[PDB]
Design a protein around this ligand. Structure first.
Ligand SMILES: [Mg+2]
Ligand SMILES: [Mg+2]
Lengths: 104, 288, 288, 102, 286, 288
DNA sequence: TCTCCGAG
DNA sequence: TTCTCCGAG
DNA sequence: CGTAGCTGAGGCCTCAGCTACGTTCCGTTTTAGAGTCATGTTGTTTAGAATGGTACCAAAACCTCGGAGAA
DNA sequence: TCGTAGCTGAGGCCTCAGCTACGTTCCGTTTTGGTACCATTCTAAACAACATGACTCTAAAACCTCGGAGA
């Protein structure tokens, strides 16, 4: 039943005002447990649409209202299929789905 | 809710940042959002952690467990204030009648023995299972003729042989003990969050120990532990340990729903307390 | 067991060595034999500590307490094997008679109004002070005609003018509020160390107030706050803040002894509880 | 009733050699009819896993063998539901699935 | 294959770049990958385009259509070399027996009249439909009988009334004609790619019209046009125009497969030609 | 209809105005009345044109032809309403008798070999030239004993040495290949203007060769290429390239007239086709 | 005396 | 001097 | 008119490293509204393989034999 | 050996506009093997999208006792 939200952004850095509302937005994301996969492209792991539907609201609430920002929901099974054409996958537990974890 | 069971056994420093638990080992490093976490086990004695972390670990419902030099649970964190309105639910707990306490406690112990027989039936002891259901049938409030005890004896003598005790210090008892501790901790947590004292058990107030009420509540769930450990009865203790963690990984038929375990115990505990406050009749049932 | 109550509120690392708790602050450093220790209070969120230390802390069944960003108790360690004497203290708290509760609370509230008067006298209201001592003299158990409240209003209206209310958004009310919260925190801390539940007040009994019993206990101390705040009534809020910290810096005549404040509240609290369990009479008195 | 491939990349810029293989790659992508949907993040429309399966090969074929490069397949139906938190839709016909066009 | 039908009616310059058709209007701009493209319609007379574009348009099997001051199709592009091996398939076309040509042409015209009846049956003329299947049953190779005409007459007189035979210049005929043009062009393209002359019809070699063989091949498909236009018979011509594009959008049961139309014509045409070279008997049906 | 054959091979924009085709190059500019025009050839890929123009080009049923990067015909415009004379020319081509095809092809191949010898003679091979004319004299229709092949071999072996082959990767072969493709293109273009299909050769008949008929027609001209290439046989390929363009710059004795080359091929091709349709006898002849 | 406001 | 076998079409 | 390949301007996006910041109730109970969360259930996608193929391009095969090189 | 928010600037990513150099390299035919293609249908299995029926908080107003600054 697990699900994965994917967020992609292209946000203007032209002005002081422009950047502020950027940094706020990246922090928001960090604080919400989002993983950075590529520069300007972050993944949030979820567990249910109800978790998803919630996390949606949170984003609407902290919408920077600048740039291009885009949200795509898929499944862990689908996200798992994603192919690395070069470079390696992130080992971070954050990115895993293991219910158990071992720091060693 | 929170789903992860995070286990630490490496010389390391734990910290907090931006809603994330922060794990530093020498080479390796990890961050993990707290919302995701359900349990923190600290296995080893080479671990450092911050007070802030603990605060935030408490702020979320996270069960923290602490361990001996020999990697055995010696303790848990016990928050005071499990709700906005801790006080409200405490006064009701105190208003709990002696009689109700009995009915409810005895209902639970019934479940304990039902599950004990079902486990026996599962290992092909068609007759001892049945023999236990008899003991069940023939009891009264606060099990005055200790039928809980008589079932339990034939339970452990049938499973692990007529010369096994349950008092003897072996890899089996260690296994169940570890297992049992785990379950108690869950209910300890869910109780507090519900707004209760754990010290004030249904049969025994805090005469001998401070987790009496949780010990009373967990009784029907022990056979879960017993299954795992039996299935690994001849494995060395550390193997038994890892196998127990299953309890969190898995799901169980609780209420026409296949549910995860901590989520079960949440609803289970709540609906029990509701009866003891007399907000409802019926009692939750749990069947393996 | 041990006798010491060890309190940490400096950015620091705690460690274990050779049966000694090890305290490192940047400059200062201290070792303390564990056998001596009875309680560990962790006030702040800037503290680091090892799992070996915690093991050994639990081995001795020393009581460990944890605190939030605002220095309030949020939780404690709960060992599976063992207890600390504080655990017992709960059952005594529950055995507290309705009558005793009254006597003791009303004694306290008497001190509140004495100290309110003494403050008004201090500011040259020879007569309003006297008018407050009258209200005091007419006290019945649990102040059923609300003398407390009527003294309190005439207190604030005389100090800060008949225009003033407590609910209005001023630099003053902020000043008091900040002040009040501080004091409460002290008593919340000292209570749980005795082994009491702050949720269960003598008169306070508010669902949404997790710290009724501490709010009851602190009542006689408020005027200390009111002095500082009034002396700076003019000053902008941040100035009030810094000036309040005086409370910890200073000393006060408590028991013929000029004592520091947290040490007062320690002895004060303890000897109040003792009376409630009926282990003594002679409630403590505090005079500004 | 289509598919949509989605390509994300993070490619090292430090050296002459590093950049060359970059441009090559982007060109390859443009030439293969990929839409740039954000900086460093491009979408290819497809109609068939068979179309997909092929396009994969082509990519394996022109692998820059540098950087982090990532491929994710979804469906048109899924892609359609993607929500734009802010900024207007990519209305270019190139990005549509309408089989009639103006 | 290619799937898009691209339509231009704005004062503009068309170009090529990096495998993309490039569309510049005064303010609006669009690139489109050619591989996606199946058809180009140039509606207006205010359109510029490059020779390179045309080359590459030809390189992909893209059908290009050209239009009047009044937005009607006056012509299309015709490529010479539709394969690596044009020559191989041409010599076979020439070895086509008179006999086979008949069988195959008449099998097709047969399909024309079935579809005509099935369209009439669809408009609840249960009986004129049956009356057309009678004309089908009786005829011979290359329609001595002119039964194609007799079915066609009762077909148009039954649909649009006894006082119209389609010679008159109205919104309806314009509609069908536009429609008919379209289908021809499909087959014209597919023929060349298979490696055939379109001028060398199964009945008439290029006496007048250079698109004879395609006109012969399309015959079973016209009713598709007639459906749309009948359904919009009472609409103004420009409405009829947009409605016809349905043909590309839509799918049709061909060989147990639901298939798109140009992809149908591809297989349809190839398997027709295979018979005329006597690589197989049977003929495709619709 | 119209009489002009308009050929474009400069980076240019074509437009329509006042019944005139409008030609803009950077420097040069030309208007041409459409009624005059019979054919439009677009040789190059650097040509821009309007859909208005095309409408009107169709209105007049002018034949429009389109060329690839290498200046070969790839297609033409096919109106629905109307035709251009050329359309008829196909049925004549099909009505070409097997016998005439022979005579005409064999006439051409005769010229090839004559010109081959004349080239050898030019390079002081008095005897091999003569040896080739022998081969020529024993020609039967469709060269069944392969005289063409045998003349050719001795031609290349004498010119470039008995070690040389045509398939080996040299600057020479590249040189001739480039040369040959040029010539072919010319005839390919001139053929389709008459209305012929290049795929349908007199003898050539190759599946994969789309230009058989042109390959047949060009044969007598190859030695022109061979001269240049031989005279630069030493030189690096890029030098050979530039020197070949001479073909278009220069003039040659065709029909007692010193004529430019495309203009030759125009008349040459036309008068060959004419013979094959049997509209005249007298095959054109071309002598280096 | 009378009537609010509002401390607890 | 008769022989093979290369490679232009 | 187009490809290929390069440069450099300037807009994106991070990170390490600065700065300044850090306890604001206590008469209790009701009510209303906006946050939680975890499961099961609908008809409907969907991977992924299977099915039956076409389009191109080289390499290697087939041709006739007059002559260069072998013997 | 605690955490937050927020800002700065170096330098790494990523794009675009703007330069440069460049631009027809077969023609004995046919067969055969390899590497691309391409549009369909069919299968259990996966999914999204509610529906279910809950529980957790927080503010604001509702409730209480009456001495008092006042009409
Ligand atoms: Mg980006
Ligand atoms: Mg990137």
């Amino acid at each position: 039943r697990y699900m994965r939200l994917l967020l992609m952004f292209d946000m203007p850095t032209d002005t002081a005002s422009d950047r502020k509302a950027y940094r706020k937005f990246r922090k928001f994301l960090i604080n919400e447990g989002f993983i950075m996969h590529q520069f300007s492209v972050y993944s949030k792991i979820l567990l249910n649409d109800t978790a998803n539907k919630a996390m949606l609201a949170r984003l609407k609430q902290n919408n920077p209202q600048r740039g291009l920002i885009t949200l795509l929901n898929v499944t862990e099974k689908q996200f798992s299929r994603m192919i690395y054409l070069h470079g390696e996958q992130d080992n971070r537990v954050a990115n895993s789905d293991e219910r158990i974890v071992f720091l060693g | 809710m929170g789903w992860r069971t995070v286990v630490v056994n490496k010389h390391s420093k734990l910290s907090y940042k931006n809603n994330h638990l922060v794990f530093k080992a020498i080479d390796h490093q990890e961050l993990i959002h707290l919302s995701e976490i359900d349990v923190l086990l600290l296995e080893t004695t080479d671990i450092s952690l911050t007070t802030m972390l603990l605060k935030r670990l408490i702020d979320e419902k996270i069960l923290v467990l602490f361990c001996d030099d020999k990697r055995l649970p010696i303790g848990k964190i016990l928050p005071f204030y499990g709700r906005h309105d801790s006080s409200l639910q405490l006064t009701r707990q105190l208003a709990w009648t002696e009689e109700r306490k009995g009915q409810v406690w005895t209902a639970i112990i019934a479940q304990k023995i039902t599950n004990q027989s079902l486990h026996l039936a599962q290992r092909d002891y068609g007759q001892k299972a049945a023999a236990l259901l008899a003991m069940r049938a023939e009891l009264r409030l606060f099990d005055p003729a200790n039928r809980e005890g008589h079932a339990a004896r034939s339970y452990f003598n049938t499973l692990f042989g007529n010369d096994f005790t349950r008092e003897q210090e072996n890899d089996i008892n260690a296994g169940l003990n570890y297992g049992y501790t785990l379950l108690l901790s869950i209910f300890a947590r869910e109780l507090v969050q519900t707004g209760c004292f754990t010290q004030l058990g249904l049969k025994h107030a805090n005469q001998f120990n401070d987790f009496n009420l949780a010990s009373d509540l967990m009784e029907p769930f022990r056979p879960l532990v017993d299954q795992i450990i039996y299935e690994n009865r001849k494995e060395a203790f550390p193997i038994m340990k890892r196998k127990l963690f299953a309890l969190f990984m898995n799901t169980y038929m609780y209420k026409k729903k296949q549910m995860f375990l901590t989520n079960i115990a949440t609803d289970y505990t709540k609906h029990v307390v509701k009866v003891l406050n007399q907000e409802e009749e019926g009692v939750p049932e749990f069947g393996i």
